[PDB]
Design an enzyme around this catalytic site. Structure first.
Site, PDB file in Angstrom:
ATOM      1  N   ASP A  75       2.782   2.273  20.016  1.00  0.00           N
ATOM      2  CA  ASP A  75       2.392   1.576  18.751  1.00  0.00           C
ATOM      3  C   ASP A  75       3.115   2.216  17.543  1.00  0.00           C
ATOM      4  OD1 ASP A  75      -0.967   1.148  17.344  1.00  0.00           O
ATOM      5  OD2 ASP A  75       0.803  -0.075  17.098  1.00  0.00           O
ATOM      6  N   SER A  76       2.954   1.622  16.390  1.00  0.00           N
ATOM      7  CA  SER A  76       3.561   2.161  15.167  1.00  0.00           C
ATOM      8  C   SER A  76       2.318   2.995  14.675  1.00  0.00           C
ATOM      9  CB  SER A  76       3.970   0.985  14.192  1.00  0.00           C
ATOM     10  OG  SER A  76       2.845   0.118  14.030  1.00  0.00           O
ATOM     11  N   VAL A 126      17.548  17.081   7.281  1.00  0.00           N
ATOM     12  CA  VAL A 126      18.934  17.674   7.241  1.00  0.00           C
ATOM     13  C   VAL A 126      19.914  16.688   6.611  1.00  0.00           C
ATOM     14  CG1 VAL A 126      20.936  18.449   8.640  1.00  0.00           C
ATOM     15  CG2 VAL A 126      18.551  18.995   9.370  1.00  0.00           C
ATOM     16  N   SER A 153       4.489   2.874   8.180  1.00  0.00           N
ATOM     17  CA  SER A 153       3.998   1.889   7.162  1.00  0.00           C
ATOM     18  C   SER A 153       5.155   1.441   6.232  1.00  0.00           C
ATOM     19  CB  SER A 153       2.893   2.547   6.329  1.00  0.00           C
ATOM     20  OG  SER A 153       2.399   3.675   7.081  1.00  0.00           O
ATOM     21  N   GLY A 154       5.275   0.163   5.998  1.00  0.00           N
ATOM     22  CA  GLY A 154       6.367  -0.339   5.115  1.00  0.00           C
ATOM     23  C   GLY A 154       7.641  -0.637   5.859  1.00  0.00           C
ATOM     24  N   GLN A 190       0.730   5.714  11.112  1.00  0.00           N
ATOM     25  CA  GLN A 190       0.848   6.174   9.677  1.00  0.00           C
ATOM     26  C   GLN A 190       2.247   6.784   9.490  1.00  0.00           C
ATOM     27  OE1 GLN A 190      -1.767   9.325   8.914  1.00  0.00           O
ATOM     28  NE2 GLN A 190      -1.662   9.348   6.752  1.00  0.00           N
ATOM     29  N   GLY A 191       2.902   6.440   8.399  1.00  0.00           N
ATOM     30  CA  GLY A 191       4.276   7.006   8.166  1.00  0.00           C
ATOM     31  C   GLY A 191       5.346   5.977   8.481  1.00  0.00           C
ATOM     32  N   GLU A 198      24.132   9.710   4.124  1.00  0.00           N
ATOM     33  CA  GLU A 198      22.936   9.472   3.265  1.00  0.00           C
ATOM     34  C   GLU A 198      23.315   9.050   1.859  1.00  0.00           C
ATOM     35  OE1 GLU A 198      23.345  12.396   4.913  1.00  0.00           O
ATOM     36  OE2 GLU A 198      21.522  13.014   5.797  1.00  0.00           O
ATOM     37  N   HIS A 211       0.816  -1.227   0.000  1.00  0.00           N
ATOM     38  CA  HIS A 211       0.000   0.000   0.000  1.00  0.00           C
ATOM     39  C   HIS A 211       0.848   1.276   0.000  1.00  0.00           C
ATOM     40  CE1 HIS A 211       0.170   0.248   4.634  1.00  0.00           C
ATOM     41  NE2 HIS A 211       0.133   1.519   4.366  1.00  0.00           N
ATOM     42  N   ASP A 265       0.252  -7.606   1.974  1.00  0.00           N
ATOM     43  CA  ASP A 265       0.745  -6.192   1.901  1.00  0.00           C
ATOM     44  C   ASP A 265       2.284  -6.140   1.957  1.00  0.00           C
ATOM     45  OD1 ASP A 265       0.652  -3.441   1.800  1.00  0.00           O
ATOM     46  OD2 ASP A 265       0.151  -3.242   3.900  1.00  0.00           O
ATOM     47  N   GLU A 296      19.851   7.469   6.781  1.00  0.00           N
ATOM     48  CA  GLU A 296      19.203   8.635   7.369  1.00  0.00           C
ATOM     49  C   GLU A 296      18.946   8.552   8.850  1.00  0.00           C
ATOM     50  OE1 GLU A 296      17.574  11.532   4.342  1.00  0.00           O
ATOM     51  OE2 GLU A 296      18.560  11.316   6.231  1.00  0.00           O
ATOM     52  N   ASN A 323      18.145  12.246  10.668  1.00  0.00           N
ATOM     53  CA  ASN A 323      17.224  13.430  10.538  1.00  0.00           C
ATOM     54  C   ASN A 323      16.816  13.462   9.038  1.00  0.00           C
ATOM     55  OD1 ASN A 323      16.122  16.097   9.998  1.00  0.00           O
ATOM     56  ND2 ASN A 323      17.187  16.930  11.666  1.00  0.00           N
TER      57      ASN A 323
END
Ligand SMILES: NC(=[NH2+])c1ccc2[nH]c(-c3cc([C@@H](CC(=O)[O-])C(=O)[O-])cc(-c4ccccc4F)c3[O-])nc2c1
Ligand SMILES: [Ca+2]
Ligand SMILES: [Cl-]
Length: 223
Positions: free
Chosen positions: A171-172, A57, A177-178, A174-175, A62, A40, A84, A52, A54
């Protein structure tokens, strides 16, 4: 991550940020050219950001690499979120080092009670939206299948498992996700869904990776 802590720069070397002009999902590096995330989270124009801490920045370490292709599982159901999982192939391989490293796929599924590390740059509020700049971590246990199905009757398939705290608060969200659910150094889950974030008796539901190892291996081998 709601109720978690700041991981510390590069202490989760396999964590990646999927970026399309902003961070929208997390993922896990499983080898130098492939990332596993959730189906999704699929969209075109994905840039994978490795090393990564931050995400606003450039601090050093990176590596920004475009995705060459994203392969959503053929049986992914967007309505039930069953299967998923998605594989992303990078345009060039990443330079692995101590700050950027891959995580191992499991050889067996984990048992209830196993303690795992969940991480991400997702929302930190259960009531409202606060998105962090650095990576957050949360240690959470895998719940029994009976507790999971009791919490989400009729919505859990054999390709999902619950992890978290029934009292709510951690908990985990939105964001996140994955991103990764790592237990004993093996990638056992992918952050998939849940009812709100950190609500009592509504734990996070994760994609059960041990059920997809042959699929991941066969797909990588043919692409
Ligand atoms: N409680 C949990 N452990 C949990 C875990 C993963 C979640 N992923 C999401 C999630 C939520 C949305 C909102 C969207 C909004 O309110 O703006 C929604 O549709 O309810 C969207 C996504 C989402 C959808 C597509 C791409 C990236 C995303 F983060 C989620 O993964 N909630 C989640 C909650
Ligand atoms: Ca950065
Ligand atoms: Cl059921």
């Amino acid at each position: 991550i709601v109720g978690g802590y700041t991981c510390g720069a590069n202490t989760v070397p396999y964590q990646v940020s999927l970026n399309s002009g902003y961070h929208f999902c997390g993922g896990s590096l499983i080898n130098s050219q492939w990332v596993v995330s959730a189906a999704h989270c699929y969209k075109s124009g994905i840039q994978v950001r490795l090393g990564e801490d931050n995400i606003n920045v450039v601090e050093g370490n990176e590596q920004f690499i475009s995705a060459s292709k994203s392969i959503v599982h053929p049986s992914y159901n967007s309505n039930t979120l069953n299967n998923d999982i998605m594989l992303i192939k990078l345009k060039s391989a990443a330079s692995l080092n101590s700050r950027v490293a891959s995580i191992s796929l499991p050889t067996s599924c984990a048992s209830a009670g196993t303690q795992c590390l969940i991480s991400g740059w997702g929302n930190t509020k259960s009531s409202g939206t606060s998105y962090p700049d650095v990576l957050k971590c949360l240690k959470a246990p895998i719940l029994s299948d009976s507790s999971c199905k009791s919490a989400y009757p009729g919505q859990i398939t054999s390709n999902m498992f619950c992890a978290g705290y029934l009292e709510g608060g951690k908990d985990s969200c939105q964001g996140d996700s994955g991103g990764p659910v790592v237990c004993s150094g093996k990638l056992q889950g992918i952050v998939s869904w849940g009812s709100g974030c950190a609500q009592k008796n509504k734990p996070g539901v994760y994609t059960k990776v041990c059920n997809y190892v042959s699929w991941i291996k066969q797909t990588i081998a043919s692409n």
